[PDB]
Every structure is written in structure tokens, then in C-alpha cells.
Symmetry: C3
Subunit: 652 residues, 3 copies
């Protein structure tokens, strides 16, 4: 590669392996790369009409799978919002459908709050997340809870299962299991009678040992020494451990206030020591630092606030934090174009004391997620709209623009003397749509899997949400919905001593609603599906016919609600026909079955009802007029032929 | 590495073994064409629709507006207007990815009664309004019954300062908004106006001038209002605005060759502020042909007023489907040639809005394709596609009824001065498409060109080798049978200026989630987050109707509604045990009386055919008079089904 | 890239940074004594595409791929595990030279006796002969995967012709004779005609008789009234593949047996020897009973005699520890490769026969190639042969299986000159051309088990790979439900390799469309998504509300709108309310809303209602019964009650019948 300084940007697309240093704003050089300069490329990873944004700062890799958690909503607020993730099982080439991790808050309507999250990661084989409850009205933090589950994982251990005759307690040795009482697990081929299939953790003895309860007592002494068996957690069946974090909430007291929790890093995996970033950007003087948890497994409510110096917390927010080899690294977001901005900091004593390096030129509006690879920090940020990156530049909103994403690479083999000469590289450009002031661009997160690093972050497209227009309600299903979606910049960070794993995708996408063309020539959908909105269809047959050909005897339509309504719309063609016909046979004719016809108010004879039952109409129970002494049985032109009763005297 | 140089070869080499090279080759003696390797042009092809409809004919409707690229086309089933919608797909990312089709016209309201439907090859934007010539054509023979100019305000956003005034006691608010393009009745939206009563969704009440309109307040102002100094937000509501629809006199088939119109095609603006524009047209039905433009001097104030301006007969003979574009006082035009054995496509220009033309015939009888183009700097970039392989060259015969790889071509004509001749025109084969082969018709080409910033787009048709089986089991041309129709759209995106920015490109690795947006819920089930209408028969294993919305609000009333003149809920003949056939309606959760009252209607196949039985442990009641339908014929009880006792206010039966 | 290797090969001590090279290859001994070659981008003009993406366990193209009338077919099985539970034989297809691939189409239904007999279908041998599709459709036990029986299934291929002349009818006859060369049709096959120029020969018809290879008849709806001969008329013909019954023929003794000479473990691979005479071969082996047998089933004329075949085996030396032959016939020579079944015994062998499988010449691959079939095609003088290890590091001879953790198994290709048949394969050069993923949470791997086909200047190795998303069989999904979580990670890939000069401008495109074939959606002028195909949901559906419209695409509105229920009986029921259980009831309405001002109503109250289990009929226009109306029990049910007296009773006779 080669880098040189230009007075004007050249035709960048013509070149390879080149980068151009250019001062768009005088005195603020940035470097613009051509293709081939870095071995990195951008992939779009969500494409839904929700406002999908804010991976900050939650990405992680676990058991070969890359997780990109984010929030799927409709605006910069918690209206209709789920904390969610998408995942990649192919090193970031393709990404799954969004999965909601939080439900809509149970008190959404009553208390006008909903969930939110910017801090999530894995520690000691458990997922941890700071799930915040925020007000719909003003986005203030009402309270915050640490949520945890055992991660989804698989083990193939040998031995370690013992049960005494007469006991219902089975003891299971499983190193660093990370389980808690009540967690859901599964066993196969255990070689220990009664320890099989789906079970629940009954007790935890130590880091490597737990118990489960058998349905019935063992009738011999059991020890599966020598037997190789299979174990899996059941993440989706395990109750979340939910622990309120005291004083983590909005407050008008500057020393209590928390604006956001953000970022997560493990200090000691086996002892559940980790840190969560936080700041107060609501009440001066600001505070920014970490919440340090000495042992989140045994004491999930116990943490201490460890802050950075005031002059680096001023005009700052949203620390990204990562621990490596005894050193905790931190970057901040600057909150003003006209004040000193983002800072890089490190601590060798778990946040009690820091060394600081300010980035020059008031880096602002972006968090700066990063990873350490070898001797370098790879640090990324994205401006919200074109031309806002440079210090002192004004916001550029309300028109469509191409915001720049930047990366720098800082050698920390020893702590740098200064970042005055930092070289930011513009590595990709995104789109800011422009018809609302808010931008989803950036607000990202960095993770690493083997020889690839991922900066996973937001960008938009030029299709308007029409908030100003016919969609002030921000309905995602109207027109093009919201243009905020996620992208992944995947950068090579080590030698790739293997032949390519890459592929082009040429398949029919078939996970969201899996369709196969049947031998009947019709599309079959092979998953249960719930439609959250109004559905119309040309005709409906309810089949009771499953995949393997089993035909149910009872075919069912069920209605929820306080009451169910099956009704007949006013006809468009011939309103005088209006009626609902319920049929015991295949067609609405008495040769095929009994029928009940309920006529509507538009019918020629409005609101009549007629029962047709050639085989006889029967009532199992007493049959009466609703009101006493008012309703006739038969009529003057509709006399029953004869009345049959056990007594021939009418009771008056 | 050919260093962007060109070679003349006796036979085509292994083109995939080179970059930045082009090869001049005469497949047909005397008719050289140039074949490019990767890299010769900074251009690439993207497939932009993938639906089982017959999706074809962007000609000549594409446009770019407020950063979005629009590719209008027709989605139907054949070369005809059966089942067809005028539609578009759009790109919000410079042509990398494209939206679901949106239908712009409904099926014609008189489709069945009058046997006609809509059609469009002319659409564009003038003065912040969408304009289209929406044709009504006969299903039987495709003849043009009538044509209408349709317009709406474009979807757009503004952020103005000041300009809203209201006098005390008035219900009229006056809105200054430059070049608004609105008409009375158009739908708009306001936010943060700083003017009481001017807020949310409103309708244009009157238009005062090009820069000023009014809206009507729900109640009279109680003071003089002027939002001077206030910055506010404005948006049109395109989809809520009525179309203005204007019949175009004599734009229809006619046996009079001076009236007859075969097709309207292409659109270009001459003056945006004064709504002056032209639409291409030709008569290819009645000799002598006519070809030229419909010129509208002011389509805003007088949408029905236009004049015909034709090219000369010499160049109208054997021609059709003019593409027209206006730049800096000059109207440029290309034609489609209609015969392999007569002089073909012509390039022309007019400095007087079509009253006179300067002509340049392309050599070698270019035919069967329209030639859409754009001017960029001193050059016209002109594109065309053969319908099937080997048809491009003059005098070549049609090559249908087998699968082939038709070539797409581009030429680049320097018009800094008008050329002396096109005899030396260099056509570059820039991409190859597929013609499927099992029907004579081809959707290849029939395209359109538009430009956004440093990219030009040729958006056009191609097929694939999957048969529609029109000869086979699908002569009805049902799109949902087998693979439907192979016609879909493609976009060739070509760099046409310096790109002084880092790449905006990305690879698409997302789960596509716009057509039926699905998320996996915390319940472990797929949730679909949009209303959906199924236009065909649906079957399902079981159904629960929930009344449960996204935010968790649960409706008290859960509803199943049936349209039609009458609604039928019926029980098919059982496959396993026909003698059980019955429908059970239940007031509780299961069909047992411990859970609720039940009505069972037995079918004709039941062991006890055609019985009805009502189960109501809490009592069965009728609010109204309850009678036999026939008089004197129906029994109440029976000899072995006696009521225990009868209770009535009078003990005398009325005979 | 930094270094242009200029298509040269380096011998290296350890693999370098391969992604920094183009046009380069590296010979490396991961295992000492077993060199393999690793390629950078550009070394071969070949690239990988993912071609299925569904949550089923989609695997085993082996060895069924083929190209017909410009379309590439990739048949496979869509199921849930290494077994036939819930499984369909299926295919996906490409109409654009392998760039994009269709939704799966099920070719076999679930076996009609799946529940009663506990068996289901399976297939590893399929192809085209004489314009018909042929497949050996196996019936296997769910419990142990043994082969119960096997059937030869065939249909005419979907095809189109544009002939001239050839249709004759005698006056007075209802038989039309159709000349169509090598039609491949059988009696009962479904066809379609257009523009025949022969009265009565039009539209959808059925084959009535077959006269010879080039001639068949159809029956007219009425007798011709003149002598008809459409000589000089150009017309149109299509088969109707999907409307033609399958010809299904049992293959005697192709089944599990404890007799080593009858036992068939699998039928596998297909190749045509003579298209016009319907001579073809199907591979097979017995790997269940020692001594093993491996070879071909040779069908001399499958059209006239689909049940007639002979077994032709390779020598015991090369059948031992072997399975799953891939077989291909070219220019009078039949080539065969085997799968090796042990890492610690001599493995895959390449063989050729000049006499249709009676005698073979053999070449053992060195180093115990095992666990993979080796599909191939011949291009010029060379066989291009492909295989994939099941998990990383299993390829080399003697290496142990490496399961139960996620890994990146290697795919390999070699190129063997068979015009000059080698003396030995000792110096075979295997190239690692792409790497797949083995997910790791179950022992079984879908990687490989592939098939090779060719279209013009491109060769396709179409085969399996996984991804790292677990199926949770150990976890909450031991039932292997595809619709739970991410379903199964097994899906198909196509490695498309340039094999001739490409003397044309690129046909390639990037895909940037909204995928819209599975459930075709358009945004309507009503601002709602419309789905433009019939759809059947095989699982439970919930929806917020439902309107049944009777309104079709062209705007035609049905007078009768229909909801129908299958089953023995249909149930429409009211669940227990979550908000206010005391309201529980179902309201059936003749008008649009549940109020008597809009229509008659029948209200059925639930057991949780304030007044449990009542039924009330509201009929302001009068309630009528056409038929006799009676209590179900005799002498037990009252008509009216003490506080619910009818005003007056009207009957033709005033005496109650007791
Ligand atoms: C991946 C998977 O499905 N694993 C399951 C496993 C498999 O079905 C496998 O084929 C057998 O290892 O079976 C598991 O259940 C074993 C269980 O069915 C029997 O061992 C069973 O176990 C008892 O429940 C018990 O241990 O209390 C009692 C019972 O008498 C006994 N039945 C028989 C015939 O032995 C397993 O291996 O644990 C469950 C896995 O989910
Ligand atoms: C692709 C396709 O739809 N092909 C059909 C084809 C075309 O509709 C077109 O009409 C070409 O002829 O029509 C086919 O049917 C035409 C047939 O209905 C008429 O020829 C009709 O048929 C007779 O009844 C008959 O042959 O028995 C005789 C009768 O006089 C005649 N009626 C008229 C008005 O011509 C075809 O060409 O076969 C069917 C194709 O599916
Ligand atoms: Na097309």
C-alpha cells in the first residue's frame, strides 16, 4: 500500500491499494481509502421495516456464533421496542432473522415504560445483560436490572454422574457449568438411570458440580464412570435471573444519576468479575466510568462505581470498555462539536486510576467501539450525517447525505505518548435518509472471531419513513417502514492460513416462512406462524393435516378475547342477500346437511333466523322465551301441527 | 490487462481471461461489434425483480427523485393487459437493492364489463408532480381505447421558515411554499408550524400561485397569526392524494392514420416551473406511420392541451417507440426500428421543440429494441438489447423457440458537436441476458435509462431458462403455478463521473424481511408484523384468532368477518370417518357441555343425517317469536320426544 | 492480493497467508507423507454459491444431479436427520447457469403407509434417459434405515417441441397419429398441443397408444369428418410432467437381505449408456453383510422392461470397505469411483470398464481416501473428481474421526488423465478448493455427499455444508423440529468451475431484488401487502383478526364466501378470556356487528360466563324452524318455564298429545 497527500480527492474508484490524505476542513486531515487498501468489506445484516438500530455496545462471539444484539423499534425512544439479536453461523457472511429477547414490558400501558439495553455479553458461560426500564415520555431511566441465563451450549463429558440407592438426588460434575437453580438442561446417553431428557437444576454445589432431582428414587447405586455422554443447556426454557441494580436510574442528584449503561467486559470469567460502562449526561457535573461487579454470580446486585477524571467526563458519554491481559481500556463519546471530544484511557488497577489520551479535533456524536488484536487497538466511529465528523462542524440534518465511517489503528504495545498524529481512515460511507433529524448511523459495536474483526453498526437508505407525511404514527408496515438497519464491516486481522470459506448466496431465502412446492403443486409453509396484524384471505380451509400426513379427527378454529364474533359484512354486490349460513355438511343446501341461517339487517327480510334440519331439530335442555309472557310459540299463520308433552295441561 | 484498449480479432478469445480489454469482432461479415472484458467499463449488472409475474417493460418510465431511483414497469402474465398492473420497484441505496413491487394502477374498474385494462410506457416527474399517460387497452387485441394523463403531487419533504399567515376570525391559512406543485384536494401534513390550527394531516383548499396555497382551519383563528422566524416541517401525502385524471382527446386507435395512436412512450420535461413536457408516441397500425411527440405547453393548468409534432416520414417508416430527453434547449430522440430488412433506428435532435429535426440513421438496420439514453457531459449513452441471440445485426432473421443468450449493447456518441455520421458507431456488448425460448415473445430489453449523481442506470428486461409452460399445463399463464413467468428486471449501473468518495457498496447478507416481516418471538414462534391480504385460497392446519396486538393490548372482541352476498361456514366430507360429519359451534373452549353451550349441525353423511342438536345446560332461550316455517305441518315435540310440560300465559292453544 | 502466483505452485513448510495471494497454490504436508495442495483465489476459475437455505435438514445430492433443456437440477432429500423421518425427495433448480436457485419442490409425498408400516421414501439414484426422468425411489424403515423395497419411478420430462407436420387423422376415425421423434412418452402420459392445424388435436390431451420410438396416438373427442394431414404446418407441443402418472415398477430383490448376494444397502448414481434404447446403469452396494458386493444394476431396456436388470460387480479386493459408487459412461467406457469406509484400510478406487461392467481395470487412490463419495465428470481427457471430508482433518489416511466440535472440513478436487490411463495414482494431486463448516453438536455430518454435473462451459459440484448454528438435538429440540430456533444447519452449495473457453461477455449479475417467489407479495393500491399464490400452512396459525373476502386478483367478487373445515368434525370455539372470563361467549351474527340492530344473533355462553352455559337466539325478524322441533330426551325438558312463559301457543289442534 501507499498513502499520499492531495489538495482535492481524486477518482478513488479507479485505484487499488491506495489511500489519500485530504483536508476537507483546513487543518483536519483524514485518509480516504481505495479498494484493496484494507482487507475488509461491508455486509448489510438486517433488512426489516422496523427501526433497527443501536448494537452499541453488545456484540459478542460464543461457541463459533457471532451475536449482534440491537433494538428493534420505531424511533429514538422505547415505543413498541424489543431488545433483539441477529446471529451469524458462517463468519458473518449471512445473518438470521431477528429474535426478540425482551417481550414488550408487562406494564407498558399501565406505567408507560418499556425495556432498553446497551450493555450485554457473556461471562462464565452465562449471558448477562443490563436490561433497563425507561419512560416512554422522556426516555429517562426508571430502573435497571441485571438479567442472566445460562448460554446455549453443548458438552460431551465422560463420567461424573452419581446417585445413591434410595435417593432422588443425582450429582453431576460438569466443569464451569455456569448454571443456577431452576435452569433448564438436557441429557442424553448418560448411562445413569433417571438422568435423561429434559431436567431442571435442583442445587449448585460448586463451580464444577450441580444436582438434579429424579422423578423417582434410584433403586441401586449408580456411577457412570467411563461412560461418555451428552449435555445441553436449554437457554430458551431457563427462567431469567433478574436482579434490580440499586440507584441505577435517572436522578437530579449528579452523583446518583445514570443516563445509560453501555458496554460490557469480563475481567475474570471463572469468578464472574465484570464491568459495565455508564455515564450521567443529564445533570452537571457529569460522571462517566464503570460499574464494577466483583462477583456477579454470587452477588449480582453488588457493584461499585469507578469514574474517570472530571475533565474527561465533561461533554462525554457512552464508554466502550474492554479488558485484556490486566489492562482495562476505555473510549468515550464526545457530546459537543465545540468541546474536547472522545478520549482513549487505560487502567492497570481495574478503574481506580486511569491514564488518558484525548483524540485531537473534538471527535463527537459517536461511541468508539474497539478491540485489541496483538499490539493494536482497532477503533471505529461513524458520523451521523456527512461532514459532522470534524471538530467545530455544525450538524447537517434534514437532507439526505452520505456519512463517513472511520477506523484508526493505535499501537499500545506501550502506552502511546500522544494521539496528536492519529490517522483516521474513511473505510466505508453510509446513508442518512434526511426526513427526520435523528440518525441511526453508527452507534455500533466491535467483536472478533478468529482471524476476522467485525464492526457492526447502523446505516440508513434514502427511502423516507414519512413521519412528516402520512405516517406520523411511525407504523413500520406502512410504505417502506423505517430505513434504519444494521451493517457489518468484516476486517482481516491475522494471517488466513486456509483456503477460502466464502460463498456467494444464490438460495431462495426460506427461514422466515419456510416454503416448499408440494406434490400438489401448492406452496406449503412448514412452521407455525402468528400474524400480529389484520389478515384477509380469498377463502379458508382449516385442514387438521400435518406434515407427515396425519389427519386430525377434530379440526379447530378458536377465538380469544372476552367474546368471539363471527359476522357477515354488508355485501357489496347484493345487500338484500346478507346472511351467515352455518352448515353441517359441505355446501349450504339441506341435501348436504342441517343449516342455520342468520339474516342481517340489510336482508329483504331483515334479522330473521331459520334453522333447517331434515333429520330433526333437537334441544337437550329447557327451551324458553327470554322474557316472560311476551313471546309467542307458533303464530297465527305458522301453527305447529301438534304439540307433544307428558302432561296435556299447559302450566300458566 | 488490456489497459482499456481495444483489439480487432478474427474470432472471440477467452474473454474471461482478461481485464480492461475489448475485442472488435465481425460475427456477421461487415458488421463489427465490440465485446468487452470485465473492467473495460466500470459497470455491473444487478437483478432487481424476482416475482412469478411477467414483469417487463420499464420502457420508458424510469426517473430519480429526492435521492430515490424509481423503476416503473408492468406486472402481468403475457404481452397483453390480462391481469396487469402498472407498478414500480425503487432503490434507496443507489441501485444496490430494490423494494417489493408496488401497484400504481388497480385492475381497471371495467375489466370484466368492458374487457379493457390499463397500460403505461410514459411516466416521469414535472414540477414536483408525478405525471403518467395511463392507457386503457382492449384485452382482445391490445388496441388503445383511450388515454388519460394521471398526476399526483410527488412524495416530498420540506423544512421551511415562516410563510404561514392567518387573519383573526378566519378559517383560511395561507401557506408560502416555493414550487409546491399542489392542486386543490391534495393531501399534506404539517409539524411544528408555530401557527395555531395548522397541524397534522390537512388538505389543500385553494392554490393562489406557484408558491402559495391555502388550507382550511377546523375553527376560526382568535388572533392574527404569522409564523415568521419559525422553522417548520412539511410533507405531501402522495398515497392519500386523489389522482388528477384527464382524458387526452384523440389519443386512441383510429382508422384515420392522422389520428391513430398505437402507443405513448417516454417522457421528458422542457420547463419544470411552467409544466411544459413532451410524451413520445407512434402510429404503427395504419399506413402511413406517424412518430413524434405530444407537446404539452402547460400541463398543470391545461392537462388536456397538447399538440402533435412528428418526425419526417423517411424516419418514421418502419419505426416505433421514441425515447426522448431534453437538455439545455435541445430535444434528443431515438427510434426503434421495426424491420430487420429496412433502415432501422435513428438518432435525432431538435432545437425548436420538435417542429424540425436533424437526423442520423444508425447503420445496419438496428431493430426490435427501443434505444433509451441519457446525456452526460458531451456524450449520449445509448442502450439496446436484442430479443434473442443473433437478431441484432441488420438482415438477421428472428431466432425464437429455443433458449438463447441475447446481447445487450451500449454506444457512446459525442454530441459536443452534432456528428457528421454514425457510420462508424461502435456498439459495445456489455452484458448478455437469457431468452427462455418456449414462447415466441421475449421480454429482453424494452428498457429505460436514468441517472443519479455519478451513476447511470439502464434498467431493462431479461429472462431465465425456467419455462412458463404456456405450451404445457399452464396455457392459462397462472403466475403461481410451477415457476410462473421468467421475465424480470435488471439494472446495469455504469460509472459516468469521477467518484471522489470511498465505496458505498455492500454485500447483502441479511434475512430479507420486508415482504412479510418476521421476527422470532420470546414465545419461540415466528411473528409477522404487517397486515396481509391473501388473494388466493388459503389452507391451514388450525386457526386461533387472537385480538392480541404488537404492544400486548388484548381486544375484548375478537372478530372473524365474511364478505360476499352470503357467508358460508361449512363442514367438508370427512376422509377418515364420514359418518361423524358435523360442525360444532361452542361457547366455551372445547366441544363438551362442561365447557359451554354447543350447537351441533350434522351433515348428510352422519349416521343420523341432517340433525341439529342444541346443548345449553344453562337453558336455551329465544328473544323472539319462535315458529315453524310452514303452517300446520311441523310438530312441536314428538310421540317419543315429549316435552315434560308446557308453560304459557294462556292455557288455551290458539288454533 | 499482494503476490500474483502466475498459476505456479510453491512447496511450503507451513501454510502462508493464502488470502494475500492470487493465482497461486501451495503443496503442504499437514500429515507427514500426505501432501495436499491448497489454492488461493484465482488459481482455478471456480467459485462457491449457497443454493438452499431452509430449516430442514437438506442434504445428499449424491448422486442425482443433471442438466436438461438448459436447466440445472439438484435433487436431494429434505428431512430432519440421517434417516427417513419426515423426509421428502426434492429438488431445487437453476435457470441462470447456477447463479440463483428455486424453492425446494417435493417430488415424493410422505409415504402413504408412513404410519401403518413405519417406512418412508429415499433416493440416491436419479437422472434422465430418452426424455424421461428415472429415479430409484427406495422405501426404507424408520427404525433402522434398512431397505424394504425399491421401485423404478419414471415420468416424461417437462419439454417443449416446435415440429412441422406429422399429425394425421383418417376421416371417420377418433385416432390421431402423431410423429414426434424420440418422444419418450407412455400410454396415459399428459401432453398439450397448440396450433396443430389438425381439428381435434388441441389443448390438453393424453397419450392413447405408442406405435414406435417416434410415433404415438391420442384419442379425439369426436370422429374426424375429413382426412387430415398437417404436413407443412409448424405447431407446438409440450409434455405435462406434473399431470402425468408416475410409472412405478418394483425392482425384484433390491432390498435388505441377510444373503450377501441379494442384499442392497443403497442404490446410488445413474448413467445412460444408450438414450434411444433406454439402456442405463444404477450404482449399488451391499455394506451390511460380509462379503460386501459393489457394482451396477444394468438395465438393458428400461422403457420396455423396467423391472429387468442384471447385477455386475467389481472385484472383491476393491469392494471390501467400499460403498456408494459414482458411475458415468462416456464414449463407450464406464467409469466408477468408490467411497472408502475405513480410515485404516485401502480406500476409494477409480475403475473403468470397456464392456459395460463385466470386467474392470482398477486404480486405488493412495492413503485410504474414506467417508466421501467421489462424484466426477469427464471433460476432454480428464476426470474432474471431487470429495469432501466430514469434519476437519479426517481426509488423510489413518486419521481419526474429529466430531463433537465445530470445524472447517476441506473440499478437494483432482484432475486425472484417463485418455492415458495411469499406471498408478500414487502421485495424485488433490487440491483443497473450498472449506465448509461442520456444526459439531451431533456426530453426523452433512458435508459433502455430493454430485457433479455439467452445462456447456461450466462444471458444478453440488454438495453439502453446515453452519455453526446448533440444531439443539442435545438441548430443547431432541424432536428435531425444523421450525424451532434455527432448525438444521445442513444446506447445499454449488462449486461452479470453468471448463472451456468463455468466448462471450459476462452473463453474471449481482442479486439485488426482493425475493418474491415463495410468497409473492406486492404492495397494493390499498397500501396493504397482497400475496399472489395459494398457500397451505402445515402448522398452527394465529392471527389478530380475519376477514374472508372472496375477492380475486382481477376484482371479481364471489357471491358466496366460504370457510370450510376438514376432519371428522369441525369445532369453532371460544377460549377462556384472559381479561374478563365472565364475558365468555361466542356470537354468531347475520349482520356486520354483534348487535340485534345489525342482524340476528346466536350467542352461546361459556362455562365461565356470569350465567354459564346458556344459549340465546336473537331474531328480531322472527325465529323459524323448517323441521320438527323436539326435546332430545323424552319427558324431561320443559317448553317454557315458571318465570319464562310463552305468551300463547299456536297449533292446528288444541289438544296436547301425551
Ligand atoms: C438426541 C436424543 O434424542 N437423545 C435422547 C436419547 C436417544 O433417544 C437415544 O436413541 C437413546 O440414547 O434417549 C434418551 O432417553 C433414553 C431413554 O428413553 C431410555 O434409556 C429410558 O430411560 C428412562 O427414562 C430413565 O433413564 O429413567 C427409563 C426407561 O426405562 C428407559 N427406556 C429404555 C428402552 O431404556 C437418553 O439417552 O437419555 C433421551 C435423549 O433426549
Ligand atoms: C398457448 C395457448 O394458449 N395455446 C392454445 C391455442 C391458442 O389459444 C390459439 O388459439 C392458437 O390456436 O388454442 C388452442 O385451441 C384452439 C382451438 O380451440 C380452436 O382451434 C378450436 O378447436 C376445435 O374445437 C378443435 O380443434 O376441436 C375446432 C374449432 O373450430 C376451433 N375454434 C376456433 C374459433 O378456432 C390450439 O391452438 O390448439 C389450444 C392451445 O392451448
Ligand atoms: Na422483463
Amino acid at each position: 500500500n501507499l498513502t499520499f497527500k492531495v489538495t482535492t480527492l481524486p477518482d478513488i474508484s479507479k485505484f487499488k491499494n491506495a489511500a489519500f490524505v485530504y483536508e476537507r476542513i483546513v487543518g483536519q486531515p483524514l485518509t480516504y481509502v481505495s479498494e484493496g487498501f484494507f482487507d475488509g468489506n461491508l455486509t448489510k445484516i438486517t433488512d426489516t421495516p422496523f427501526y433497527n438500530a443501536w448494537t452499541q455496545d453488545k456484540t459478542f462471539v460464543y461457541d463459533n456464533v457471532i451475536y449482534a444484539p440491537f433494538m428493534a423499534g420505531e424511533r429514538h425512544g422505547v415505543q413498541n421496542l424489543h431488545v433483539a439479536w441477529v446471529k451469524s453461523g458462517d463468519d458473518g457472511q449471512t445473518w438470521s432473522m431477528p429474535e426478540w429477547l425482551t417481550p414488550i414490558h408487562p406494564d407498558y400501558t399501565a406505567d408507560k415504560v418499556n425495556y432498553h439495553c446497551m450493555s450485554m455479553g457473556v461471562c462464565g458461560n452465562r449471558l448477562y445483560a443490563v436490561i433497563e426500564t425507561r419512560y416512554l415520555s422522556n426516555m429517562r431511566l426508571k430502573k435497571a436490572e441485571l438479567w442472566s441465563r445460562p448460554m446455549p451450549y453443548y458438552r460431551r463429558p465422560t463420567g461424573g454422574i452419581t446417585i445413591s440407592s434410595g435417593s432422588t438426588t443425582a450429582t453431576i460434575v460438569l466443569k464451569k457449568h455456569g448454571l443456577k437453580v431452576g435452569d433448564a438442561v438436557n441429557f442424553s446417553n448418560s448411562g445413569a438411570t433417571g438422568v435423561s431428557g429434559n431436567m431442571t437444576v435442583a442445587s449448585v454445589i460448586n463451580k464444577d458440580t450441580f444436582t438434579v432431582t429424579l422423578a423417582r428414587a434410584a433403586t441401586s447405586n449408580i456411577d457412570n464412570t467411563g461412560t461418555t455422554w451428552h449435555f445441553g443447556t436449554r437457554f430458551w426454557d431457563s427462567p431469567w435471573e433478574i436482579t434490580e441494580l440499586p440507584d441505577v436510574a435517572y436522578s437530579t442528584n449528579a452523583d446518583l444519576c445514570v443516563t445509560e449503561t453501555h458496554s460490557f467486559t469480563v475481567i475474570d470469567d471463572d469468578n464472574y468479575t465484570f464491568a459495565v460502562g455508564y455515564h450521567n449526561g443529564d445533570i452537571s457535573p457529569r460522571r462517566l466510568g464503570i460499574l464494577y461487579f466483583n462477583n456477579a454470580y454470587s452477588d449480582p446486585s453488588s457493584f461499585t462505581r469507578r469514574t474517570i477524571s472530571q475533565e474527561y467526563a465533561d461533554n462525554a458519554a457512552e464508554p466502550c470498555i474492554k479488558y485484556y491481559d490486566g489492562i482495562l481500556y476505555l473510549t468515550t463519546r464526545g457530546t459537543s462539536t465545540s468541546a474536547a471530544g472522545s478520549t482513549l484511557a487505560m487502567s492497570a488497577d481495574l478503574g481506580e486510576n486511569w491514564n488518558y489520551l484525548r483524540f485531537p479535533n473534538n471527535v463527537h456524536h459517536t461511541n468508539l467501539p474497539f478491540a485489541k488484536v496483538g499490539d493494536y487497538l482497532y477503533i471505529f466511529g461513524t458520523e451521523r450525517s456527512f461532514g459532522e465528523w470534524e471538530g467545530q462542524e455544525l450538524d447537517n440534518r434534514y437532507k439526505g447525505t452520505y456519512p463517513r465511517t472511520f477506523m484508526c489503528k493505535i499501537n499500545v504495545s506501550s502506552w502511546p505518548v500522544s494521539l496528536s498524529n492519529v490517522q483516521w481512515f474513511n473505510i466505508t460511507d453510509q446513508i442518512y435518509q434526511g426526513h427526520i433529524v435523528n440518525s441511526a448511523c453508527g452507534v455500533g459495536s466491535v467483536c472478533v472471531k478468529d482471524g476476522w474483526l467485525y464492526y457492526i453498526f447502523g446505516g440508513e437508505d434514502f427511502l423516507s419513513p414519512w413521519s412528516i407525511g402520512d405516517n406520523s404514527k411511525k407504523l413500520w408496515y406502512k410504505h417502506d417502514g423505517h430505513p434504519a438497519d444494521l451493517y457489518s464491516y468484516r476486517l482481516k486481522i491475522t494471517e488466513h492460513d486456509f483456503v477460502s470459506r466464502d460463498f456467494k448466496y444464490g438460495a431462495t431465502p426460506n427461514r422466515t416462512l419456510p416454503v416448499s412446492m408440494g406434490t400438489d403443486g401448492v406452496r406449503h409453509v412448514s412452521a407455525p406462524v402468528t400474524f400480529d396484524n389484520d389478515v384477509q384471505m380469498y377463502s379458508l380451509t382449516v385442514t387438521g393435516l400435518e406434515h407427515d400426513g396425519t389427519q386430525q379427527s377434530a379440526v379447530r378454529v378458536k377465538l380469544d378475547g372476552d367474546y368471539g364474533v363471527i359476522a357477515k359484512n354488508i355485501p357489496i354486490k347484493n345487500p338484500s342477500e346478507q346472511r351467515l349460513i352455518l352448515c353441517g355438511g359441505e355446501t349450504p343446501y339441506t341435501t348436504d346437511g342441517s343449516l342455520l341461517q342468520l339474516y342481517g339487517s340489510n336482508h329483504t327480510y331483515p334479522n330473521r333466523a331459520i334453522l333447517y334440519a331434515p333429520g330433526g331439530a333437537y334441544t337437550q335442555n329447557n327451551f324458553m322465551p327470554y322474557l316472560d309472557g311476551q313471546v309467542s310459540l307458533g303464530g297465527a299463520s305458522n301453527r305447529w301441527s301438534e304439540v307433544y308433552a307428558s302432561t296435556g295441561t299447559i302450566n300458566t
